[PDB]
RNA sequence: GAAUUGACGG
């Protein structure tokens, strides 16, 4: 890295800043500058300063020069990818490649570039799989081979509200032979190396990504998963099942088996259910790591026999799970009960009994789940009633949202409890970003109209303030849609009083328009006639 | 629109 090389890439960088360069000329300069890297790919790409310029060049050049850079750097690509700066250079090369996925003329030239990369990785993959930087490069490479260009937290694999909502029940072809080739290369180690891969954070993350990209590819999943579990008809031998069970409380492995259970084909799921989990459900549910594996197991159960086993092992202990901070386990059991149509009423009753012991407690099932952590962390639970001002409990509210997807037959204690909360509590619930989802699930449930109406009426006087927030505005429209003319008019006039402020809100203009607040203000008789025709 | 209780970068 002589100073002339340094001056060159710095001068290229300033030239792009000064935005005096046409986008077509910019693209050609990017290509010329890449040629200045030939023979020095590793040195340029891993330089703490020049790597950032090399990212700019890769993202601004044309396909041919990108491919030329990838081909000339392939023999050092694992070294670039495991470097703390070079790994961003490597990822820029992939994002750049990915911008051409929609161009059918580019198919074979992209595939050749991926082959250069996969070939040198497959030759020696295990340290790159476990390297904190190279693991990000492998995840992106796997996505590209699948034809996925657009980043997804799920695939990489972060937690997200789409995934939580999915767990609770609320396309380019790619380069399939390159995906198979690379992922087979990552998995052709000894069973004893694989044991360590199960438990290394960074390699577990790579395998999580690969499993998600193979979703619904049963023939590949049935080859891949047994290698990862060290099983290679699919059968888990008794000693291997013990080893999988023993590793289940590990933070890295627990994340991996979460994904395995999500993508597992039916026959493979059933074998895992029976041989690994079947008599350990509660012990695994109380572990800080394993309980998320149990949530994934619960969510993907196939049939009523499995539902019964999970019921027998876990419902008697619902109170333990809530006390110990494992509400996600209960949420999942409740959610899959409504999905498999099994043990619905047994699940709902076990939840009531877990929160409300004596008969007098049961009218408080709703407040206690809205503030699940305050009630269970309470000093004196026989006097606890509310958490004034507190933020409501995400998972307690998600449980309730599942509860209100049951038929009214199974959830009468929940409907009676919610609809009988006093106005101040119902109002605080609607103003909470989680509690508003509870209200909305109840308005969408098949509870009686009279009962919905009772709750909505206790919101009178607060629709204006409710509407001034993004979450409340949805609740206001859900209440409105559920109302007769008398209450639609009540809500409409409350929004009128706050119409100035409401219009300065993100959602306000839409809400004002959907409810037709201007018509109501200016020609109320015609607004009432159009609403009545609904 | 609130998004679990246990991980990730120059």
Swiss-Prot record:
Span of domain PUM-HD: 223-534
Keywords of this entry: Nucleus, Repeat, RNA-binding, Translation regulation
First and last residues of every Pumilio repeat: 36-71, 72-111, 119-157, 185-226, 239-274, 275-312, 420-457, 458-493
Biological process, per Gene Ontology: regulation of translation; response to glucose; response to sucrose
Keyword RNA-binding among UniProt keywords: yes
Keyword set includes Repressor: no
A GO term, aspect molecular function: RNA binding
Superkingdom per UniProt: Eukaryota
Cellular localization per UniProt: Nucleus, Nucleolus
CC per GO annotation: nucleolus
Function: Sequence-specific RNA-binding protein that regulates translation and mRNA stability by binding the 3'-UTR of target mRNAs.
Domain notes: The pumilio repeats mediate the association with RNA by packing together to form a right-handed superhelix that approximates a half donut. The number as well as the specific sequence of the repeats determine the specificity for target mRNAs.
Protein name in UniProt: Pumilio homolog 23
Gene that produces this protein: APUM23
Part of the whole protein covered: 88 to 640 of 753
């Amino acid at each position: 890295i002589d100073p002339e090389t340094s001056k060159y890439f710095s001068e290229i960088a300033n030239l792009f800043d000064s935005n005096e360069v046409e986008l077509e000329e910019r693209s050609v300069i990017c290509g010329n500058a890449l040629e200045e890297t030939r023979g020095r790919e590793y040195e340029i790409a891993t330089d703490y300063i020049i790597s950032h310029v090399l990212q700019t060049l890769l993202e601004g050049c044309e396909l041919d020069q990108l491919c030329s850079f990838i081909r000339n750097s392939a023999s050092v690509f694992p070294a670039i990818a495991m470097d703390r700066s070079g790994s961003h250079v490597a990822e820029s090369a992939l994002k750049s490649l990915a911008t051409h996925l929609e161009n059918p003329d580019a198919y074979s030239v992209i595939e050749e570039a991926l082959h250069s990369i996969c070939k040198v990785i497959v030759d020696n993959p295990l340290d790159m799989m476990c390297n904190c930087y190279g693991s990000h490069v492998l995840r992106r490479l796997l996505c590209l081979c699948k034809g996925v260009s657009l980043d997804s937290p799920e695939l990489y694999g972060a937690k997200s509200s789409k995934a939580l909502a999915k767990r609770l029940n609320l396309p380019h072809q790619g380069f399939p032979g390159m995906l198979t080739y690379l992922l087979s290369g990552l998995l052709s180690c000894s069973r004893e190396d694989m044991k360590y891969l199960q438990v290394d954070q960074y390699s577990s993350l790579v395998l999580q990504t690969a499993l998600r990209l193979m979703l619904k590819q049963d023939e590949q999943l049935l080859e891949i998963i047994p290698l990862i579990l060290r099983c290679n008809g699919f059968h888990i031998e008794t000693n291997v099942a013990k080893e999988i069970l023993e590793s289940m409380k590990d933070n890295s492995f627990s994340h991996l088996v979460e994904v395995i259970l999500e993508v597992a084909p039916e026959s493979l799921y059933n074998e895992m259910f029976n041989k690994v989990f079947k008599n350990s459900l509660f012990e695994l549910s109380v572990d800080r790591c394993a309980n998320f594996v149990i949530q994934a197991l619960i969510s993907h159960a196939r049939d009523q026999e499995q539902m019964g086993i999970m019921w027998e092992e876990l419902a008697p202990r619902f109170k333990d799970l809530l006390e110990q901070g494992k509400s996600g386990v209960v949420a999942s059991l409740i959610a899959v009960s409504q999905r498999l149509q099994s043990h619905e009423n047994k699940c709902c009753e076990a939840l009531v009994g877990a929160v409300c012991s004596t008969n007098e407690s049961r009218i408080s099932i709703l407040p206690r789940l809205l503030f699940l952590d305050y009630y269970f962390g309470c000093r004196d639970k026989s006097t606890w009633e509310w958490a004034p001002g507190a933020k409501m409990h995400v998972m307690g509210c998600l449980i309730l949202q599942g509860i209100f997807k049951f038929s009214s037959d199974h959830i009468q204690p929940y409907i009676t409890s919610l609809t009988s909360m006093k106005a101040e509590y119902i109002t605080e619930t609607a103003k909470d970003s989680s509690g508003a989802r509870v209200i909305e699930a109840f308005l969408a449930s098949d509870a009686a109209t009279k009962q919905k109406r009772r709750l909505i009426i206790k919101l009178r006087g607060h629709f204006g303030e409710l509407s001034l927030h993004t979450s409340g505005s949805f609740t206001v429209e859900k209440c409105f849609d559920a109302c007769n003319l008398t209450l639609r008019e009540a809500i409409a006039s409350e929004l009128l009083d706050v119409k100035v402020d409401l219009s300065k809100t993100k959602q306000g203009p839409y809400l004002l328009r959907k409810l037709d607040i201007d018509g109501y203000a200016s020609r109320p008789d015609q607004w009432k006639s159009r609403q009545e025709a609904k």
